[PDB]
Amino acid sequence: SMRYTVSNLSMQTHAARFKTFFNWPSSVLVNPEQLASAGFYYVGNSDDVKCFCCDGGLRCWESGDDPWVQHAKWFPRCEYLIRIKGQEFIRQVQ
Amino acid sequence: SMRYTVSNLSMQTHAARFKTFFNWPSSVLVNPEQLASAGFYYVGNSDDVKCFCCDGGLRCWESGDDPWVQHAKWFPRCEYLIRIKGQEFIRQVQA
Ligand SMILES: [Zn+2]
Ligand SMILES: [Zn+2]
After folding, report:
1. Which is nearest to A24 in space by CA: A10, A13, A11, A34?
2. Which of B45, B60, B61 has the CB atom closest to A7's CB atom?
3. CB B37 within 8 A of CB B14
4. Distance between CA B69 and CA A24 in Å, rounded?
5. What is the Cα–Cα distance from B18 to A4, expressed in whole angstroms?
6. Are A5 and B75 in contact (CB under 8 A)?
7. How far apart are CA B24 and CA B32, in angstroms?
8. Quick one: DSSP state of residue A73?
9. Which of chain B's residues have a Cβ under 8 Å away from the Cβ of A57?
């Protein structure tokens, strides 16, 4: 067996993730560009997103929700979140 | 936002983990019995499994893979692994 850190290899790029928000509702008010930058792609319902790396799923996004802060709130061990924001950032949010 | 994906905390029992392997691919030649015993549950994607305790992810399972040995190979600090098999076993595998 091999260790893996990335659940969805097909969603590793920003463009691949951002494309999934083509049919995302304008009533949500969290920006799909920022969601995509934070590792998330749209998977169903009104606003379900998953992280391509940790495979964590978040929904019921509130206006003013910060995609990176939510990622660190719920999924602090995510290796993508660590690579971009660093463990200091995560420790701060936790 | 709210999490909706499954938590490692729901996978603490052998039975709950075993249950996840209902659709485990026939082509993957490692038995769900030994996987569940070793702390792993199936995440529904391909042959990806995760440990309920250390959250380690393993894929690409090969014929004859011993899940306990693989757990010790890749995640030697896992507290579940330590509790069941011991550090003597883990050290043995690591060298
Ligand atoms: Zn993540
Ligand atoms: Zn483990």
Report:
1. A34
2. B45
3. yes
4. 44
5. 21
6. no
7. 8
8. H
9. 3-5
Question: Is B3 strand, coil or helix?
Answer: strand
Distance in angstroms (rounded) separating the CA atoms of residues B61 and A91: 34
Tell me the resolution in Å.
1.9
Structural domains present in chain A: 1-94 (1.10.1170.10)
Collapsing DSSP to helix, strand or coil, B86 comes out as coil
**Partner residue facing B59 (CB), from A4, A8, A61:** A4
Structure tokens of A54? 């940790």
Cβ–Cβ contacts within 10 Å for residue A34, how many?
A: 13
The technique is X-ray
DSSP B59: E
> How many residues in chain B?
95
